[PDB]
Amino acid sequence: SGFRKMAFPSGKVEGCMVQVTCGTTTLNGLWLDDVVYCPRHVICTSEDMLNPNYEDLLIRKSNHNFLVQAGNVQLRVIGHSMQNCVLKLKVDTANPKTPKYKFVRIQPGQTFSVLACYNGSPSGVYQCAMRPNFTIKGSFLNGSCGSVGFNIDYDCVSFCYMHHMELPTGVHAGTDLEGNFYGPFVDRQTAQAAGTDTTITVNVLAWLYAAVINGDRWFLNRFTTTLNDFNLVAMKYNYEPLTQDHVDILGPLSAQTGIAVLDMCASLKELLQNGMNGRTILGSALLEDEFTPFDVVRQCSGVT
Amino acid sequence: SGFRKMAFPSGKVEGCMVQVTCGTTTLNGLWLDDVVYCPRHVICTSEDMLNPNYEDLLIRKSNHNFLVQAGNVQLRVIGHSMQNCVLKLKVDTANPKTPKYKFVRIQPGQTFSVLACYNGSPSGVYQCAMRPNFTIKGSFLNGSCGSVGFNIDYDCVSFCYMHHMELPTGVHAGTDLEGNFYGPFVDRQTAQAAGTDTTITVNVLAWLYAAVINGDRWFLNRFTTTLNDFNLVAMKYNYEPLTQDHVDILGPLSAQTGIAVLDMCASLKELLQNGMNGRTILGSALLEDEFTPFDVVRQCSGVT
Numbered sequence A, B: 001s002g003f004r005k006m007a008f009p010s011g012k013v014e015g016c017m018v019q020v021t022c023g024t025t026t027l028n029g030l031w032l033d034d035v036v037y038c039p040r041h042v043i044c045t046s047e048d049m050l051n052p053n054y055e056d057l058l059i060r061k062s063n064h065n066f067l068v069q070a071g072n073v074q075l076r077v078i079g080h081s082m083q084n085c086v087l088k089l090k091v092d093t094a095n096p097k098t099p100k101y102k103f104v105r106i107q108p109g110q111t112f113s114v115l116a117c118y119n120g121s122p123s124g125v126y127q128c129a130m131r132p133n134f135t136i137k138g139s140f141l142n143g144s145c146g147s148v149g150f151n152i153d154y155d156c157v158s159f160c161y162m163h164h165m166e167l168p169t170g171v172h173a174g175t176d177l178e179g180n181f182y183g184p185f186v187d188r189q190t191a192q193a194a195g196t197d198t199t200i201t202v203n204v205l206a207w208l209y210a211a212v213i214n215g216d217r218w219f220l221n222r223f224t225t226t227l228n229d230f231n232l233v234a235m236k237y238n239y240e241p242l243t244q245d246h247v248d249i250l251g252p253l254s255a256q257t258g259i260a261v262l263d264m265c266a267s268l269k270e271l272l273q274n275g276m277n278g279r280t281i282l283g284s285a286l287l288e289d290e291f292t293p294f295d296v297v298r299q300c301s302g303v304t
């Protein structure tokens, strides 16, 4: 037992990290098969980022201008193309460590692991969630761009995020691996504000189920509620509305604990209305929303 | 910017995980060079754990009784020995993926990453701290024993923990890689209670410095304090006493932020005495103590 914010083992992704340099700009790239993926702003100078015309800036770059280094060895770039906000650098060598992989575009509320990198070298791994406002709250310093977010299903790595930007508020924005930004963000040094960062209700409920499985039960009450009644309270507290699809997804946790989904909703409602009163749940003094129902099942069952 | 509970990239450790089976007991082993390290309770049945005499139980085991499997391939065991609470299984093949490594015995308050494994396969990675009562609050199910805790200094993995037990309270106990338990715990199915889980004061201060670096400054006050005055409050709140050695270790963070250590202590004192008043620091509603001063520096600088 015990319940932790857990990331996927990062080995499969560490074997894909490379350094990409274009002029004086250096960031991370993801090497899969014979293609290196990286943010297209690798071609920009600081002056370019105020209002970059990427198609125009890219005309001045040739294959030999993209310096790709995997560990201590240089890769030969034999092609380059821009797909949305990512550059795809075709190299002459397939990455021998390429895992089975997929590119997926996640939904708000979904979680993933990030392998934060600098100069193509991994520094750490942490668990994130795509916020309902399409930002992520990461830990990214200058040079971390090109670090990726991913999930793993046994031996298949599903890449879902590539880091591109930090908003003036310190929150993060990036793209899927086809180069499309999550949310309305653009790769330009222009002040872009995030929308409301609402709480992922279905994740909070999943985490309350993880708490009951792991021994923290003080918050369980004698009440029940309905979806409509719960949602009036969810709206008041800037929580995402709960749907029947979310109830369905929580079914396995409901079954395992014997606590009906709407009863857990009534516990959540009282926690929202009364607070924690100085108490903690799974060592947290706030309601955690960055564990999905699948994450709780995975951790509580021991999937490898 | 942004500050996250971050684990070390786990690739170097994933390459060392193996499965060890003895009779009907299966757990994880750590394969480094030609030795596989695992908890000695792999030799026990459930009946043995009530009061095991390990030297006696081990006499009945031969090299061929320890089944060691690295991925899908079996390793040949050519020797076995017990060192404290770990078994060392000499195998005929050096692990080709053995990283540069060391075995270290950490101090309470120190943090490390855990690669939780089942059947020699990695399931996830999270960050822990050795509590002042010599327990860790992990996420370990049956079969996770033998999973290890570690730190990494560029290319050197320092192994510090091997998981052995879960106390009846749901907290965890284990050994260093020489098989010595942290704290007074023994590998036996006997109720053993943990001492006071005090808060690691120097880590809380480091995390408050990380908060000021990352923009969360509301808690900074107009006060200062002394070590002795601070420690009267630390004692009242079950915080570890702060020493001059801890002040010295926080020097770089003090220098970077321009906030004297004792001034940060006065902010901590007011937070202890008044609470957070519904506010958060780095997204937490409680004072986080599982980041060391070195962790804050590492994360805030981008060490790979």
Ligand SMILES: *CC(=O)N1CCN(C(c2ccccc2)c2ccccc2)CC1
Residues within 6 Å of the ligand: A025, A027, A041, A042, A043, A044, A045, A046, A049, A140, A141, A142, A143, A144, A145, A146, A163, A164, A165, A166, A187, A188, A189, A190
């Ligand atoms: C994540 C990372 O490595 N950085 C943050 C984004 N920086 C961009 C940039 C590109 C080229 C020259 C200067 C700065 C950037 C700036 C503004 C908006 C989007 C991206 C690079 C460092």
Ligand SMILES: *CC(=O)N1CCN(C(c2ccccc2)c2ccccc2)CC1
Residues within 6 Å of the ligand: B025, B027, B041, B042, B043, B044, B045, B046, B049, B140, B141, B142, B143, B144, B145, B146, B163, B164, B165, B166, B187, B188, B189, B190
């Ligand atoms: C961590 C893990 O895999 N487990 C928890 C400890 N279990 C021990 C054990 C050994 C052999 C047969 C049954 C149980 C154990 C029990 C009691 C005290 C210490 C260790 C194995 C599963």
